[PDB]
Amino acid sequence: DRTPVTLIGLGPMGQAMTRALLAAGHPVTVWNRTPARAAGVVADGAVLAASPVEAVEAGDLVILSLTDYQAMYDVLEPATGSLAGRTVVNLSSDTPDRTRAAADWATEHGATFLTGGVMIPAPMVGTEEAYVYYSGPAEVFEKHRTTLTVIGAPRYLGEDTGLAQLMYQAQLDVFLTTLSSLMHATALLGTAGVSAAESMPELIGMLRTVPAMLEAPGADIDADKHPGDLSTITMMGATADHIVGASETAGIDLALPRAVQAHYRRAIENGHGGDNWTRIIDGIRSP
Amino acid sequence: DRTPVTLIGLGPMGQAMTRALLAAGHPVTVWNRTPARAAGVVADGAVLAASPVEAVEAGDLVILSLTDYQAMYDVLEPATGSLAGRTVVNLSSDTPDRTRAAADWATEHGATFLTGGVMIPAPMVGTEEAYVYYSGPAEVFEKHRTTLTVIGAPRYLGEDTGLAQLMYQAQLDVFLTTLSSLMHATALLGTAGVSAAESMPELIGMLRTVPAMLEAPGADIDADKHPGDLSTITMMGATADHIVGASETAGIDLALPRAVQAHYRRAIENGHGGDNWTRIIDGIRSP
Ligand SMILES: NC(=O)c1ccc[n+]([C@@H]2O[C@H](COP(=O)([O-])OP(=O)(O)OC[C@H]3O[C@@H](n4cnc5c(N)ncnc54)[C@H](OP(=O)(O)O)[C@@H]3O)[C@@H](O)[C@H]2O)c1
Ligand SMILES: NC(=O)c1ccc[n+]([C@@H]2O[C@H](COP(=O)([O-])OP(=O)(O)OC[C@H]3O[C@@H](n4cnc5c(N)ncnc54)[C@H](OP(=O)(O)O)[C@@H]3O)[C@@H](O)[C@H]2O)c1
């Protein structure tokens, strides 16, 4: 379609999403707290609205790409009288319960609301590897599906506005924790004079094979199948201890490896040392 | 090659390494704290030594596959008089400084010592995807290299007996932390009724693309290049906050997400909110 889209928030993601939408033939009206930041997308065909009200009134679809949901309230408060009959799609990080309350806030101002969690960095927006989680009213998703698909293949999760946000937080839980561990291991090796340039390829090389190493688990966790034939919590917990020890001696952050160590210690304390590592999920669920 | 090899410790890794060595034509003499556990490898051609001394005396190469280095002292103490002239290869998890002291202990008993860290699970032992870090005397590595290659491609790191162990701990830092985060995210989604069988493929699907998403870092960390064009610590820190918040509300472990949150808080506190996420390594290095 060539339906008009409004996009508020021109960080790298809003800029990429704007460009994707322009390339696909949508007129895009933008607004940004910092108008100078819109110069690039305006040169590429975006229209810079002078005020939030003007931006909101430009289209029946308002996409938000902001750091958090407080930013949505900040920018849309002067425009709440212009929301009726439009769909707000918030593509921003926050808690699921912030998101759920925001959806009701939209309804109160006469708008529909969809939650989106964009699952790739800005350069990958609008490519074949892009995808976005969505949740909220099915009818509102279907209405805008074809426009939204320009950004990334949609994965609709259902009616709960919180759910796409929960999926995003869970995905970023894995992503951010993995990244922190890469920096932690890089730091640890750096302590014996190993370059990050030497370290990081070794660590990434291993990380690339992790899905495979795991398959050499979801249903098993659901089925309580935690058998320790090829790797026990005892043995992995010992390695967790060795990492804490090495970290202590290296003088680097202890909080991250200690959180991991605790997952194993809890499982052993509860009498499941002989089980597979998936067993640590029980202590995680019940601190 | 057909050099005789002794392997002590018949967990899944010792069993796999024994079988790989037998398949490649090496006579393998085994000993285990629990002799019944050797029935399988003996059926496949291994010789079960009655005592640790007998096992050590069977060959010039003694491989240890035990949960930690204390286990090495436990099993080899009765046999310290039979170590002279032989090479101990310890393929067990422990701290780098435990490893370094153990190497000197071997030297005092007239043996040579090599550190190894086996980087794949037991089913992948002896396959084209297997690899093992080694460190210790170059001459001792060269002497046994062709036997050791049966287990996996060697990656020799140099003379410091601690270094292959530090590499192993840094690798398992990433691997265990990644796994903990998978279980953490699985738990978080399970809190809204999402199955692990539904959750885990979504999480793995994302994890598979992490090397790619990163390239869409080592030399930059070495060069202090931490520019926040496409993703800032401010923005990623906010998501870390949202994960903590979602975790609080879900009633799951807070220690793991809080350790990640702290990486970001520290960087912002030190005035680097505008930087790329790699900047968290500075606070990690200086707790
Ligand atoms: N970058 C990524 O790779 C990536 C990937 C997927 C998801 N995300 C998510 O996408 C969203 C946008 O991220 P991003 O990296 O593009 O950018 P960002 O650094 O979060 O900035 C996005 C926009 O937020 C605006 N903003 C922040 N606080 C505001 C406030 N209180 N009032 C008004 N405007 C406010 C900024 O305004 P100014 O321009 O005036 O500073 C900017 O336009 C975030 O929720 C993030 O978690 C990011
Ligand atoms: N499993 C993997 O996927 C994997 C991958 C790479 C590296 N590793 C490392 O490889 C090593 C072996 O791990 P694994 O999973 O094969 O097995 P494991 O569960 O660590 O057990 C290995 C052996 O240790 C013995 N043992 C432990 N404590 C002992 C003690 N105090 N005295 C004597 N024997 C003792 C056990 O004796 P019993 O048989 O009598 O119980 C068993 O034979 C570990 O250091 C682990 O970190 C494991």
* Together in a domain, A201 and A257: yes
- Strand order of the sheet with strand A153-156? A47-48, A28-31, A5-8, A61-64, A87-90, A112-118, A131-135, A153-156
Q: Cβ A183–B278 below 8 Å, yes or no? A: yes
Query: A254 CA to chain B: closest CA distance, Å?
Result: 8
- Atom of ligand 1 at shortest range from CA of A94: 45
Q: Would you list the DSSP string of chain A? A: ----EEEE--SHHHHHHHHHHHHTT--EEEE-SSGGGGHHHHHTT-EE-SSHHHHHHH-SEEEE--SSHHHHHHHHGGGGGG-TT-EEEE-----HHHHHHHHHHHHHTT-EEEEEEE-S-GGGTTSTT-EEEEES-HHHHHHHHHHHTTTSEEEE--S-HHHHHHHHHHHHHHHHHHHHHHHHHHHHHHTTT--HHHHHHHHHHHHHTHHHHHH--HHHHHTT--B-SS--HHHHHHHHHHHHHHHHHHT---HHHHHHHHHHHHHHHTT-TTB-GGGHHHHHH--
Question: What phi and psi, each to the nearest 5 degrees, are found at residue B50?
Answer: -75, -30
| A224 shares its domain with A269 | yes
B39 and B150 co-located in one domain? yes
Which of A62, A121, A65 has the alpha carbon at shortest distance from A91?
A65
Last residue of a domain, one of A105, A138, A158: A158
Q: Which CATH number goes with the domain that contains A279?
A: 1.10.1040.10
Distance CA B150, CA B146 (A): 7
Domain shared by B89 and B54, yes or no: yes
Which residue carries 């709440």 as its tokens?
A: A80
With CB atoms and an 8 Å threshold, state whether B238 touches A184: no
Our measurement of the distance from residue B202's CA atom to the centroid of its chain's CA atoms, rounded to an integer in Å, reads 26
Sheet containing strand B131-135, edge to edge, reads: B47-48, B28-31, B5-8, B61-64, B87-90, B112-118, B131-135, B153-156
B259 vs A141: CA distance, rounded Å: 36
Point out the ligand nearest to the CA of residue A65. 1
Residues with Cβ within 8 Å of residue A108, at least 6 apart in sequence: none
Together in a domain, A42 and A100: yes
Q: Are B6 and B31 a contacting pair, CB within 8 Å? A: yes
Q: Which of A116, A141, A158 is the last residue of a domain?
A: A158
Q: How far apart are CA B106 and CA B87, in angstroms?
A: 9
- Tokens for A40, please give them: 């690039």
Residues A44, A16: contact at Cβ < 8 Å?
no
C-beta of residue A169 within 8 angstroms of C-beta of residue A96: yes
> CATH code at B148?
3.40.50.720
Taking the C-alpha atoms of residue B192 and residue A166, their distance in angstroms, rounded to an integer, is 8
Between the CA of B100 and the centroid of ligand 2 the distance, in Å, is: 20
Residues B146, B9 within the same domain: yes
Question: Is the same domain home to B151 and B183?
Answer: no
DSSP string for A99-126: HHHHHHHHHHTT-EEEEEEE-S-GGGTT
Owning domain of residue B21: 5-159
> Which of residues A128, A158, A188 is at a domain's end?
A158
Q: How far is CA B209 from CA A120, A129, A183, in A?
A: 9, 9, 18
Extract the tokens encoding A137: 């009213």
Q: Is B75 in the pocket of ligand 2 (CB under 6 A)?
A: yes
Closest of B115, B113, B77 to residue B96, by C-alpha? B115
Same domain, A135 and A178: no
Domain match, A231 and A256 both: yes
Q: For residues A97 and B176, give the distance between their C-alpha atoms in angstroms, rounded to a whole number.
A: 30
| The total number of structural domains that make up chain A | 2
Cα of A208 vs centre of ligand 1, distance in Å, is: 29
Put simply, whether A46 touches B (Cβ < 8 Å) is no
B84 & B152 share domain: yes
Does one domain contain both B196 and B122? no
Q: Which method resolved this structure?
A: X-ray
Helices (H) and strands (E) in chain B, counts: 13, 8
Whole-number Å distance between alpha carbons of B225 and B218: 10
Which residues lie closer than 8 Å to A253 by C-beta, 6 or more apart? Answer: A184, A187, A247, B259, B262, B263, B283, B284, B287
**Shortest CA gap A283–chain B (Å):** 8
Does A138 lie in the same domain as A78?
yes
**Virtual torsion, Cα A210, B283, B169, A261, nearest 10 deg:** -80
Going by alpha carbons, the residue nearest to atom 33 of ligand 1 is A71
Q: Which own/partner pairs from A68-73 qualify as long-range (CB within 8 Å, at least 24 positions apart)?
A: A68/A92, A68/A93, A68/A94, A68/B238, A68/B242, A69/A94, A69/A98, A69/A99, A69/A102, A71/A9, A72/A102, A73/A105
Q: Which of A232, A158, A207 is nearest to B212 (CA)?
A: A207
Q: What angle do CA B224, B228, B234 make, to 5 degrees?
A: 115
**Is some CB atom of chain B closer than 8 A to the CB atom of A47?**
no
Buried b (16+ CB within 10 A) or exposed e, B257-271: bbbbbbbbbbbbeee
